[PDB]
Amino acid sequence: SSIPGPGYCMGIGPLISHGRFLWMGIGSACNYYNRVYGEFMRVWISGEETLIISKSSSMFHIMKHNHYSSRFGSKLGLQCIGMHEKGIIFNNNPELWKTTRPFFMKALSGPGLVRMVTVCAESLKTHLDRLEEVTNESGYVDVLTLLRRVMLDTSNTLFLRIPLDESAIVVKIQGYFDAWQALLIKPDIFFKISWLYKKYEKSVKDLKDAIEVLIAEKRRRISTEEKLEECMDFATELILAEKRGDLTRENVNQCILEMLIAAPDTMSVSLFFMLFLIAKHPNVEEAIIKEIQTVIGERDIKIDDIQKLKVMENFIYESMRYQPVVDLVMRKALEDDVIDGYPVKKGTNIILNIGRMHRLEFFPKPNEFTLENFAKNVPYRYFQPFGFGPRGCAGKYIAMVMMKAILVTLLRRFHVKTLQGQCVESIQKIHDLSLHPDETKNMLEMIFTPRN
Ligand code: HEM
Ligand SMILES: C[C@]12CCC(=O)C=C1CC[C@@H]1[C@@H]2CC[C@]2(C)C(=O)CC[C@@H]12
């Protein structure tokens, strides 16, 4: 077959291509190349060869096998954000990731997934009763900040539960993600011109220190406590492993940070896009309101309710399909392999353009938002919003629950209006790492009006 992509020009090929990624941003850079060349094609970030693939069959082969259970990134960029062989998200040491992941997996399923449905609802209730902290004079709600605040609140009360400053931390987290996003594929030259990179080294330290205060108190509380087996929360589980010397304090500290940011980083942006889609799609809103009245009514939301919320479940999926936030997945080849009739050496970086994949394959009406796409049960080998197998999203289950929870408890109480002209398609979007809205532009607010 042989491998498609731009020409090697001795040092130039890898320089224009890396440049293209730094200029446009990973998201749009990937779409570019996919659109120009094949759905399977080669590029260069830093020195290293990297493939950018939207072929559903390649995606499936890659996520399924254990020998793609790695990601990649600037070592110096990762060391800076403290993800270099520490958390799980970009922990690329196979032996440390293999031993760390279990803690996340356990915390994000079973009993904790059941509490989460009832804790998302409470934390949103408490914040909808406090709308005065996010609403404009002309009645504009800052949906983004609201969603981040609750998300953080939920994550905290479930995984750490130490009193913190919601408002402050959300900003710090917001900065950290920006740092993470920037430094992730910066070439090494970047890390010499300091009055250029240490804008970020700041955001990182600010969050890292803010948390070191919380993990400090959680340690104090544990040392004395109430004899352990209350509900072993993520944070405890970790500290006790650290205490048995299964983990190092550095590792534990990063893990907690990674858990607290994951929700606000992605859920808020996802739900924000969803609320924007609900506004501009009135017939769908009725469907969801009916389904709510049928299944839940005026009752509190409980775990048993969530399986029956099928219309909503299909809205949620169709939203992530049509307007993804996490539209690309970074992986690394650990062994030699033929991948859809292509030679893939170990050490080859991979970007899985799962956003473009949800447009080009399977779906009846791939290029418009309709629950038509999910009218017939979807194979999942054709639809990967979270990924799967050894290294798929750790919260892939708890997320789906949380979104149902907070959508119900919102749409229950409020009709949601988009600002005059606005819709998701006409929003300034940064397409790099994640696909989030441009927050320097504006009219990203919404109007909450009661249902009755
Ligand atoms: C709701 C929107 C979310 C989306 C679309 C999403 C999607 C993804 C995707 C596509 C990956 C890449 C997995 C792979 O390599 O196949 C991932 C990784 C991950 N996600 Fe999610 N996720 C979401 C929410 C969450 C939440 C709420 C949490 C935790 C509370 C979470 C925790 C993680 C972690 C820890 C990883 C790294 C897994 C690893 O490499 O070990 N995600 N996510
Ligand atoms: C879901 C996630 C982790 C939790 C978090 O804090 C925020 C994000 C957003 C970016 C995701 C990332 C997981 C790894 C992903 C899928 C990649 O390989 C490229 C983009 C990136």
Swiss-Prot record:
Tissue-wise expression: Widely expressed, including in adult and fetal brain, placenta, skin fibroblasts, adipose tissue and gonads.
Residues engaged in binding heme: 393
Effect of residue 393 to Y: In AROD; complete loss of activity
Domain of life of the organism encoding this protein: Eukaryota
PTM (free text): Phosphorylated in vitro by PKA and PKG/PRKG1. These phosphorylations inhibit the catalytic activity as measured by estrone synthesis from androstenedione (36% decrease for PKA and 30% for PKG/PRKG1).
Residues that, per the record, bind substrate: 265, 330
Subcellular location field: Endoplasmic reticulum membrane; Microsome membrane
Pathway the protein contributes to: Steroid hormone biosynthesis
Keywords: Disease variant, Endoplasmic reticulum, Heme, Iron, Lipid metabolism, Membrane, Metal-binding, Microsome, Monooxygenase, Oxidoreductase, Pseudohermaphroditism, Transmembrane, Transmembrane helix
Cofactor: heme
Family stated for the protein in its record: Belongs to the cytochrome P450 family.
Protein purpose: A cytochrome P450 monooxygenase that catalyzes the conversion of C19 androgens, androst-4-ene-3,17-dione (androstenedione) and testosterone to the C18 estrogens, estrone and estradiol, respectively. Catalyzes three successive oxidations of C19 androgens: two conventional oxidations at C19 yielding 19-hydroxy and 19-oxo/19-aldehyde derivatives, followed by a third oxidative aromatization step that involves C1-beta hydrogen abstraction combined with cleavage of the C10-C19 bond to yield a phenolic A ring and formic acid.
Name of this protein: Aromatase
Source species of the chain: Homo sapiens
Gene name tied to this protein: CYP19A1
